[PDB]
Amino acid sequence: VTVTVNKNPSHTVPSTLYGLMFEDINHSGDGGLYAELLQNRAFQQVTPNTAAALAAWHPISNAKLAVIQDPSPVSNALPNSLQFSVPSGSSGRVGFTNEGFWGIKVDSTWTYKASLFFRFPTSSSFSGALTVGLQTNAGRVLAQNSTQIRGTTTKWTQINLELHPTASAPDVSNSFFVTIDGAAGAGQTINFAMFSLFPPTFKNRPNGLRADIAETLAEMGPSFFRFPGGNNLEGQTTATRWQWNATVGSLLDRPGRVGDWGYVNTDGLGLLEYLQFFEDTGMEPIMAVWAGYSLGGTSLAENQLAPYIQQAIDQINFVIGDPAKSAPAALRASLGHPEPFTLRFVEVGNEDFFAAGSYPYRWHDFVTALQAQFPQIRFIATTNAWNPVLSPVPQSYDVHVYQTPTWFYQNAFYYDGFQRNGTTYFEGEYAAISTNANDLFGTVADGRLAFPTVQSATGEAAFMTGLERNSDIVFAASYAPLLQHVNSTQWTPDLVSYDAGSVIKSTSFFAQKLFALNKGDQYLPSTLPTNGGTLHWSITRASSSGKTFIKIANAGSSAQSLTFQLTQFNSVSSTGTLQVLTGPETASNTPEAPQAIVPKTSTIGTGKTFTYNAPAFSVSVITVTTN
């Protein structure tokens, strides 16, 4: 096919076109992006005196463990304590371990920060060292530090100890430990609460993020971060919804919540930590507010909304408000960030098409209130576009689609026929998730993708060329889900996967990265691809530099030739760069082969005419300079 490139741009490409979608799913927050290494660190939202309250915790030697409703808890938010009892007659090493989130990476190049709170409920004569550390799951100690404690300490006391491993572990099958001398401790009980173990964090942020994952997200050049959901915003019930205020301040005062994917969220990754990450990466937020619906099917009545609308206002004021004018903004200032953060986009609920009966009044009441307080924010509706009819008329809709790879290339013209009437569209969740059109949300045996494939990424890339062509009305687009702990998965496929020690960048991740990093501010119209065809392209140009990015998706099984005609330009560089992602149709990056499919960069001859053969199942970016 001959592709003629117009020199005259048709529209400005939004700064926001490519970004990320985040919720805590697949242990993407706790166990993932949030750097805390101990699972069930503070016994949040568990039932005292149950086995499940002890999840991730194990005795050393003859230690007796129970999670109790402490008569004197460390805080109101953390009513549960670990009761650690040493039997009479004990000796040697007695204590307990935490297995982490399916392991803990122990790296001698890292300093770890351990902490805990303790008290003796019964004043005792105990006088001896409390040791914390890291051990292999065979009990081989790799790091340790200690401090003196006294049985007379009957009020909560924090211990803070650094840990320096003597050797890196050969795998992630390691645990955190706490021990005392069994003879010194014989017959005694200690209550513990609010444990933590951190590695070095991204940008050395206090209470920050896991470095390899954070860097991987930054590597993709995202422009926005949609958060905190997604389903995990909604709760199963009003009472279990995400609440911003429960996520800010001291970790002692964060109660955690049962999230929407089968596990407790600590809310250690809370609103301020999200905002700091955006500062650290240059992303801007697309922040959701809870909108009166939860996943059990309950809509709050219209005459019930006011306190929830106020909570949304409070949430936004925490982000952007003048500290002198609201308590949430004063709180932001008091936590060390008096300056407002950026916030241009707020999403009202999540997937309210499932609650489209009540969304008209919820949308109306939330948006009229929020727009009145925040006249510069653009509010995004979550129902299906234009059905039901909302008031006020939405400026934006969030469109989600989970489909087959084929659907994505067949639907690259999704936005071409939309009216240009002042509405913008956020493709806030999309992914090619299955090869089985008859059972998209099924099992792997029934065609569900365990990991993105070259087929899925190239189908998505074809669709993305349509997002970029239609970026006069498409302002933002994010794959979902973003992150997956391979040891605790509720949804596949996911953009980036990991275990306790390493990261897997998917085929889809590379398609995302190639689109986001090679994106000009000008859209250059070109010969249209065949609507329904497997071969797609989109061309943009950087106004300041003339860097011109030709993005090509071949989502099909046939190689396809493209001849590019740039004769309208005064000049075209004599060479360009080629970045190509390709491989067998069903190839994936997996924990066992994490670099099976990676992009390749080379230099090609260019000018006013050049020919490229786009391989079967490929994403290609050709970069030339044009003036």
Ligand X SMILES: OC[C@@H]1O[C@@H](O)[C@H](O)[C@H]1O
Ligand Y SMILES: *[C@@H]1O[C@H](CO)[C@@H](O[C@@H]2O[C@H](CO)[C@@H](O)[C@H](O)[C@H]2NC(C)=O)[C@H](O)[C@H]1NC(C)=O
Ligand Z SMILES: *[C@@H]1O[C@H](CO)[C@@H](O[C@@H]2O[C@H](CO)[C@@H](O[C@@H]3O[C@H](CO)[C@@H](O)[C@H](O)[C@@H]3O)[C@H](O)[C@H]2NC(C)=O)[C@H](O)[C@H]1NC(C)=O
**Residues near ligand Z (CB under 6 A):** 243, 245-246, 255, 307-308, 311
Question: What are the Cα distances from residue 170, in Å, to 108, 132, 137, 140?
Answer: 11, 21, 11, 12
Nearer to ligand Z, 246 or 313 (CB): 246
Does residue 480 bind ligand X (CB under 6 A)?
yes
| Closest distance to ligand Y from the beta carbon of 385 (Å) | 6
Question: What are the Cα distances from residue 506, in Å, to 494, 497, 597?
Answer: 8, 8, 8
Residue from 44, 189, 231, 497 that binds ligand X (CB under 6 A)? 231
> Segment near ligand Y (CB under 6 A), from 162-170, 183-191, 302-310, 329-337?
162-170
Strands 284-289 and 264-265: unpaired
| Closest distance to ligand Z from the beta carbon of 312 (Å) | 10
When CB distances are held under 5 to 8 angstroms depending on the partner's kind, the choice from Cl ion, ligand Z, ligand X, none that residue 406 binds is Cl ion
305: helix, coil or strand? coil
Does residue 145 bind ligand Y (CB under 6 A)?
yes
Residues linked to residue 505 through DSSP beta bridges, in sequence order = 496
Tell me, yes or no, if 351 is annotated catalytic. Answer: yes
Q: Binding string to ligand Y for residues 396 to 425, with x set by CB under 6 A, is what?
A: -----------------------x-xxx--
Q: Which residue has tokens 């306790």?
A: 500
Q: What is d(CA 304, CA 438) in angstroms, rounded to the nearest whole number?
A: 40
Q: Binding string to ligand X for residues 586 to 615, with x set by CB under 6 A, is what?
A: ------------------------------
Q: What is d(CA 498, CA 311) in angstroms, rounded to the nearest whole number?
A: 35
Q: What is d(CA 115, CA 398) in angstroms, rounded to the nearest whole number?
A: 42
Does residue 460 bind ligand X (CB under 6 A)?
no
Does residue 487 bind ligand Y (CB under 6 A)?
yes
Alpha-carbon Rg for the chain, nearest whole angstrom, is 27
| Closest distance to ligand X from the beta carbon of 402 (Å) | 7
Which 490-529 positions form the footprint of ligand Y (CB under 6 A)?
A: 499
When CB distances are held under 5 to 8 angstroms depending on the partner's kind, the choice from ligand Z, ligand Y, Cl ion, none that residue 537 binds is none
Strands 284-289 and 93-98: unpaired
Does residue 19 bind ligand X (CB under 6 A)?
no
Q: What is the DSSP string of 559-588?
A: -EEEEEE-TTSS-B-SEEEEEEEE--TT--
Strands 345-348 and 284-289: parallel
- Spell out the residues 6+ positions from residue 583 whose beta carbon is closer than 8 angstroms to its own: 454, 507, 596, 597, 617
Sign for the CA dihedral angle at 267, 269, 273, 278 comes to: negative
Sign for the CA dihedral angle at 244, 249, 250, 253 comes to: negative
At residue 98's C-alpha, the angle toward residues 95 and 100, to 5°, is 165
> Segment near ligand Y (CB under 6 A), from 59-67, 159-167, 307-315, 615-623?
159-167
| Closest distance to ligand X from the beta carbon of 21 (Å) | 7
How many other C-beta atoms are found inside a 10 Å radius of the C-beta of residue 306?
12
Does residue 352 bind ligand X (CB under 6 A)?
no
| Closest distance to ligand Z from the beta carbon of 53 (Å) | 20
When CB distances are held under 5 to 8 angstroms depending on the partner's kind, the choice from ligand X, ligand Z, ligand Y, none that residue 480 binds is ligand X
Given the residues 351, 427, 429, 460, select the one marked as catalytic.
351
| Closest distance to ligand X from the beta carbon of 232 (Å) | 6
Residue from 98, 350, 404, 573 that binds Cl ion (CB under 5 A)? 404
Does residue 347 bind ligand X (CB under 6 A)?
no
Cβ contact 381:413 at 8 Å: no
Taking CB atoms, the residue at the shortest distance from ligand X is 231
Nearer to ligand Z, 69 or 568 (CB): 69
Q: Which residues are tagged catalytic?
A: 351
Q: What is the contact surface with ligand X in residues (CB under 6 A)?
A: 23, 25, 229-231, 350-351, 400, 429, 480-481, 491
In the complex, the residues that contact ligand Y under the rule CB under 6 A are 102-103, 145, 160-164, 385-386, 389, 393, 419, 421-423, 486-487, 499, 591-592
